[PDB]
Amino acid sequence: ANAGQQVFIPTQSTIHIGGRRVLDLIIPRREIAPNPTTLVAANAMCMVRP
Amino acid sequence: QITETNVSEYYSNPIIATKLSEMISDQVKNNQFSTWRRDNTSLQGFNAFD
Amino acid sequence: QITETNVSEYYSNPIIATKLSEMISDQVKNNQFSTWRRDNTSLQGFNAFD
Amino acid sequence: PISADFSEVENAPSFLSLAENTDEVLKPYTGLEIQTIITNIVGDANPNQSRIFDQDRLRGNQYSAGGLVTQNAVSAIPFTNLIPRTIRVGNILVNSANRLQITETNVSEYYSNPIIATKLSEMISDQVKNNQFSTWRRDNTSLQGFNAFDIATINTAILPNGLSLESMLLKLSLLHSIKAMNVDAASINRSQYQVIDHNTVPTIGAPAVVGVNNSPVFGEDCGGNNPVYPFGGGTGAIAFHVTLQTVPDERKSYAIFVPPAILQATSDANEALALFALSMSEWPHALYTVTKQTTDLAGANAGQQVFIPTQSTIHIGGRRVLDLIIPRREIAPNPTTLVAANAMCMVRPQAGPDATAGAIPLAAGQLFNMNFIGAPAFEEWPMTSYLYSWAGRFDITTIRQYMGRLATMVGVKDAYWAAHELNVALSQVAPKMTTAAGGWAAQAANSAQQSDVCYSSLLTVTRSAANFPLANQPAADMRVYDTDPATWNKVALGLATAANLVPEQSMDVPFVVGDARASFWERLQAIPMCIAWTMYYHSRGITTLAWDNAYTDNTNKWLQKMVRNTFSTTQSVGTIIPARYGKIVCNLYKNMFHRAPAYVATSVGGKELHITHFERWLPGGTYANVYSGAGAVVNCFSPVLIPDIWCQYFTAKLPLFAGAFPPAQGQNSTKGFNSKQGLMIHRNQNNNLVAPYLEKFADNSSYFPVGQGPEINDMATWNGRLWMTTGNVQYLDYSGAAIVEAVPPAGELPVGKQIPLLAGENAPIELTNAATTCVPRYSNDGRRIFTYLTTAQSVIPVQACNRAANLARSCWLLSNVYAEPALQALGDEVEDAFDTLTNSSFLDVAKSVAESAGEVPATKALTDLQAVDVSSLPSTSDPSNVLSQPAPLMSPPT
């Protein structure tokens, strides 16, 4: 008689592990070049742009 | 509901150095300046000084 | 009038590596930075990183 | 065989001797054993030249008990698959009053022959690992027109079970069995149209027409031109993808690749695609119909009758929607634009030559609008309508070539043959018997009793209780294997292999798959199955009402066991296990026909076991019972389906209690067993009831002790048949009281179905077309049942047991012959001159491909040379091995 969407919270979503808060990730570069100094020289440089 | 965990350090199975890292440290010992030049990079995409 | 064709992959007679490509992969293994410098090129006319 | 003298029946094998395990190898039952006996065709003949339209009966001379001979006497072939939806009534053809039959399957995963990854997969993993040294995202791993990112994800996380292919092959075989009706009328039996409608006559000149959704009554058309699934009532969905990326996230895991190796014919390949799509969606997608011209028994009134094939009503559950991932014509970057895509699809799908209405209407021949990244909108079609359009275009000869290429990818011989065995087992069907004194009877036209029918296993077929589409699912009748899309994707691309999956030649496809004679041949393959199940149920005396309530009853512990053990409801180590007493019926088959049933393996912890169709039935159904002449049901007999002449003329060897009564020869006629055999007569307080020589335990069990039931004993059963075959038996308690089970009007026995006669035929006489062996012994409430005669009626038969008198009987005048097997291969084939001109080359190229599964000319020794760091290649640190079952070892404790 009474259809509707209904909400459920997964148990996996509630477990707490790790918790490291801040992170710095280093990425591969497309070309054999010295470390970038201008902004465009930086953005064009990396293997993938996040 | 909530769950928690005590994450712990893993000292079991300590690592072994590759012959690559061995020769690198040898080059640091004998002070081989050329190997970590400013614009040298691997095909991996990371520069040699790192 | 018209004609067509099913082009197919040719797996017969698989290729062998030259000693040149062998030593190149050895240089990639042992991480020889100098061999693929930024401005190195062959007399063929193609640069080394390629 | 028929017996010539009483010496032969007296020396016949005991039942236990025929039920023993047999260890020898044996050939498949092709159904040609029965063909050379009931037909002109001994040896080969062209189906056109033979007129097997008239080869549809058992014929012969009969001898009467009174000494007369009836020449050209006849008997119908009991089985069929066609269901009339318009019955002749009062010479005038009219709509059916009765609802259609239905069937259900329990599809599921089970362990099959153990599976192992191929060399091609190792090369792929090494390509990835070597690719990891360079900051280039590159497409070395592409194969057969598929994206490099797809081959990578098809190369991951293999499933231990194995691969089956069985449900696929079922759907194909059912389809073939239906399209085989489409051939000319000269080579389908006349009888096949008149097993259920005995008042109609088919016309030879015009072929039958196979349509879809045409039925007049009970909503049988599934929306007609606008279609829906007959069972679920829904509509499917189907979508074609160049690459897996365009598949919505809700269903990227269920996607199936469509390998390029099919579609290699210059024959329309857009149809082969449709027949790949049909063999993996839910079945039936629509109710097929067979319309045939027929006429009145006087020949006077003519019309078009409508029929439903039994193959078209059996439900193999599965997948409403499909993503079909098509091969790319030219190796290339993924088609970000449309024109790059369509001009590069190896085939561009389009609807078949038929229009459809409703939402998403489809004009004939309409083209699918390809899916690619950045497209303005997603596109799909209802699949019931997409399949509705090609439904008129399949035919036997194209299924043969389709399966011929399919055989080149995966071996399909033995698997298909087993699927065909399931086909015959679930589709061939026969009407319930009528009791009478004489040789023929049939139920009143357009009655519920006229249309009630049973399987070769003596289980009744269930009916629908409401108009289609059905709102609610029926119980499963039998359980089959399922075909995983995941390991299908792995196997089609050469990435995985198993001992059952070794590739075969296109010539290995079994003969039934091509021929127009196939309908007749399926019709003949179901008889030995009933002979096996009949000897099984008749070895013990248990009545129909007693089987009917057995699974649950608490009156007797033995009966519950006796039923629980005949169905397949057990497991171990994650796999199906065969029914315990199905093996008896299997042995019984092998020993009587000297032929082996088709089987498939199940791996119990790496140990293969054979399952046959005898072992995979499921509980729930009512058992087969005869009707009175007035239509009242009769419970008292053991289950029966066919006249015993079928059981006894077509077996190489037979059980003793079931042999034919010997011909009169001078003084001798028939005879009975006595106390010299270990038997003894039953008597009670009444002085006017006499029962035959029976077992000595019969004296001490008005009720069977709990934990115990009647035991096999051929001779007492023989005597029970002698009491029954007199015209005036009485079915009663130890005391002479009435049993609870419904009993026939006095002196009547079940008798075979009537069909119209041809000129020169005669009807069967007396008990020449009756069942006789169904001798009740175990009552529903635990009592014995005794066959009694009054004293004066009792005197001649008892002396016949004492070998001092003779009892008259009727018989067929037929001699015995049983052929050595017609063919070893399971496939027909003949050398042409060119086959001999080009022999050796084929012989070794064949073997060079059979070993070549998952091989490429490049070997690891070559591709090592190109590698950067050979020691770190996974093929080095992980030589590949066959996965163990139920699962491979993980996390060993060092």
Residues D534, D631: contact at Cβ < 8 Å?
no
Q: How far is CA D287 from CA B2, D226, D446, D469, D735, in A?
A: 54, 13, 22, 11, 55
Residues D639, D624: contact at Cβ < 8 Å?
yes
Residues D718, D673: contact at Cβ < 8 Å?
yes
On whether any CB of chain A is under 8 Å from the CB of C38, the answer is yes
d(CA D145, CA D493): 11
The bridge status of strand D321-325 relative to strand D430-431 is unpaired
Q: For residue B43, list chain C residues with Cβ-Cβ distance below 8 A.
A: 28, 36
d(CA D353, CA D366): 9
- The 3-state secondary structure of D404-463 reads HHHHHHCCCHHHHHHHHHHHHHHHCEEECCEEECCCCECCCCCCHHHHCEECCCCEECCE
Residues C17, C24: contact at Cβ < 8 Å?
no
Residues D794, D690: contact at Cβ < 8 Å?
yes
Task: Please tell me which residue of chain B has the smallest CA distance to D133.
Answer: B44
- What method was applied to determine this entry? cryo-EM
Query: CA nearest D577: which of D615, D618, D620, D617?
Result: D615
Q: For residue C36, list chain A residues with Cβ-Cβ distance below 8 A.
A: 32
Q: Cβ of C31 and B42 within 8 Å?
A: yes
Q: Cβ of A35 and B47 within 8 Å?
A: yes
Q: Is the dihedral of CA D829, D831, D834, D836 positive or negative?
A: positive
Cβ partners under 8 Å of residue D68, min gap 6: none
Q: For residue D331, list chain C residues with Cβ-Cβ distance below 8 A.
A: 9
Q: How far is CA D373 from CA D242, D244, D340, D471, in A?
A: 10, 10, 12, 39
* Six-digit token string for D670: 């028939």
Q: What is the DSSP letter of D89?
A: E
Q: Is D296 helix (H, G, I), strand (E, B) or coil?
A: coil
d(CA D332, CA D638): 70
d(CA D506, CA D209): 30
Q: How far is CA D710 from CA D696, D774, D785, in A?
A: 12, 14, 11
Amino acid at D388: Y
A18 bridge partner residues: none
Query: CA nearest D4: which of D814, D806, D819?
Result: D814
Q: Is D141 helix (H, G, I), strand (E, B) or coil?
A: coil
On whether any CB of chain A is under 8 Å from the CB of C50, the answer is no
DSSP string, D170-181: HHHHHHHHHHGG
Q: What is the DSSP letter of D507?
A: G
On whether any CB of chain A is under 8 Å from the CB of B1, the answer is yes
d(CA D558, CA D701): 15
Q: Provide the chain C residues 18-37 that lie in CB contact (below 8 A) with chain B.
A: 28, 30-31, 33-34, 36
Q: What is the DSSP letter of D246?
A: G
Name the burial class of residue D41, with classes exposed (0-12), middle (13-18) and buried (19+) by CB atoms within 10 angstroms of its CB. Answer: middle
The bridge status of strand D730-732 relative to strand D786-788 is antiparallel
The bridge status of strand D57-63 relative to strand D256-257 is unpaired
Residue D277 sits at φ, ψ, to 5 deg, of -65, -35
Task: Please tell me which residue of chain C has the smallest CA distance to B35.
Answer: C33
Query: CA nearest C29: which of D141, D861, B19?
Result: B19
Residue D565 sits at φ, ψ, to 5 deg, of -85, 5
DSSP string, D20-84: S---S------SHHHHTTSSS-SS---HHHHTTTS--EEEEEEE-TTS-EEEEEEEE---B--EE
Query: CA nearest D813: which of D775, D772, D762?
Result: D762
Q: For residue C38, list chain A residues with Cβ-Cβ distance below 8 A.
A: 31-33
Nearest by CB to D868, which of C9, C16, C25? C25
- D209, containing H or E segment: strand D209-212
* Mutation for testing the A interface, residue in C31, C33, C38, C40 having most A CBs under 10 Å: C38
Task: Please tell me which residue of chain C has the smallest CA distance to A30.
Answer: C49
Name the burial class of residue D624, with classes exposed (0-12), middle (13-18) and buried (19+) by CB atoms within 10 angstroms of its CB. Answer: buried
Neighbours of chain C (3+ CB pairs under 8 A): A, B, D
Q: How many CB atoms lie within 10 A of CB B35?
A: 16
d(CA D530, CA D641): 7
DSSP string, chain C: -----------SS-----HHHHHHHHHHHTT-GGGG-TT-B-TTS-BTT-
Q: For residue A32, list chain C residues with Cβ-Cβ distance below 8 A.
A: 36-38, 49
Torsion angle of alpha carbons D252, D254, D260, D264, nearest 10°?
A: -130
Task: Please tell me which residue of chain A has the smallest CA distance to B41.
Answer: A32
Q: How far is CA D533 from CA D536, D539, D589, in A?
A: 5, 10, 9
Query: CA nearest D517: which of D176, D203, D272, D205?
Result: D176
* Mutation for testing the A interface, residue in D135, D136, D137, D138 having most A CBs under 10 Å: D135
Task: Note the residue count of chain A.
Answer: 50
Residue D804 sits at φ, ψ, to 5 deg, of -120, 5
Q: Is D623 helix (H, G, I), strand (E, B) or coil?
A: strand
Cβ partners under 8 Å of residue D273, min gap 6: D258, D263, D324, D347, D349
d(CA D880, CA D874): 10
The bridge status of strand D237-241 relative to strand D321-325 is parallel
Radius of gyration, alpha carbons of chain C: 19
- The 3-state secondary structure of D551-578 reads CCCCCCHHHHHHHHCCCCCEEECCEEEC
Q: Provide the chain D residues 833-872 that lie in CB contact (below 8 A) with chain C.
A: 856-858, 862-863, 865-869
* Six-digit token string for D730: 């009485």
Residue D379 sits at φ, ψ, to 5 deg, of -135, 140
Q: How far is CA D579 from CA D318, D424, D479, in A?
A: 25, 20, 12
Cβ partners under 8 Å of residue D414, min gap 6: D500, D598, D600
Chain C nearest CA to B29, separation (Å): 18
Neighbours of chain D (3+ CB pairs under 8 A): A, B, C
Query: CA nearest D788: which of D738, D745, D750, D742?
Result: D738
d(CA D4, CA D502): 50
On whether any CB of chain B is under 8 Å from the CB of D133, the answer is yes
* Six-digit token string for D572: 């171990």
Cis peptide before D886 (omega within 30 of 0): yes
Q: Cβ of C33 and B48 within 8 Å?
A: yes
D37 bridge partner residues: none
Cβ partners under 8 Å of residue D139, min gap 6: D147, D148
Query: CA nearest D343: which of D335, D355, D351?
Result: D335
Q: Nearest 5 degrees, angle CA D491-CA D497-CA D502? A: 100
Residues D227, D130: contact at Cβ < 8 Å?
no
Name the burial class of residue D701, with classes exposed (0-12), middle (13-18) and buried (19+) by CB atoms within 10 angstroms of its CB. Answer: middle
Cis peptide before D756 (omega within 30 of 0): no
* Six-digit token string for A42: 């930086």
Give the up-direction half-sphere exposure of residue D804: CA atoms within 13 A in the CB hemisphere: 6
Q: How far is CA D504 from CA D263, D402, D406, D414, D849, in A?
A: 18, 14, 9, 11, 9
Q: Cβ of A33 and C38 within 8 Å?
A: yes
Question: D346-361 burial, b for 16+ CB within 10 Å, e for fewer?
Answer: bbbbbbbebebebeee
Cβ partners under 8 Å of residue D37, min gap 6: D649, D650, D817
Query: CA nearest D636: which of D647, D645, D623?
Result: D623
D356 bridge partner residues: D362
Cis peptide before D469 (omega within 30 of 0): yes
Q: Cβ of C49 and A32 within 8 Å?
A: yes
Q: Cβ of D133 and B43 within 8 Å?
A: yes
Q: Cβ of B41 and A32 within 8 Å?
A: yes
Q: For residue A11, list chain B residues with Cβ-Cβ distance below 8 A.
A: 1, 3
Taking chain B, what is the end-to-end CA distance rounded to the nearest angstrom?
A: 45
Q: For residue A47, list chain D residues with Cβ-Cβ distance below 8 A.
A: 135
Q: Cβ of B45 and D135 within 8 Å?
A: yes
Q: For residue B45, list chain A residues with Cβ-Cβ distance below 8 A.
A: 27-30, 47
d(CA D883, CA D117): 9
Q: Cβ of C14 and D862 within 8 Å?
A: yes
Q: Is the dihedral of CA D215, D221, D227, D230 positive or negative?
A: negative
Contacts made by residues D815-822, CB under 8 angstroms, sequence distance 24+: D815/D2, D816/D1, D816/D2, D817/D37, D818/D1, D818/D33, D818/D652, D819/D33, D819/D36, D821/D27, D821/D30, D821/D595, D822/D30, D822/D32, D822/D33
d(CA D102, CA D81): 12
d(CA D380, CA D503): 34
Cβ partners under 8 Å of residue D515, min gap 6: D47, D396, D521
Residue B17 sits at φ, ψ, to 5 deg, of -70, 140
Q: Cβ of C28 and B43 within 8 Å?
A: yes
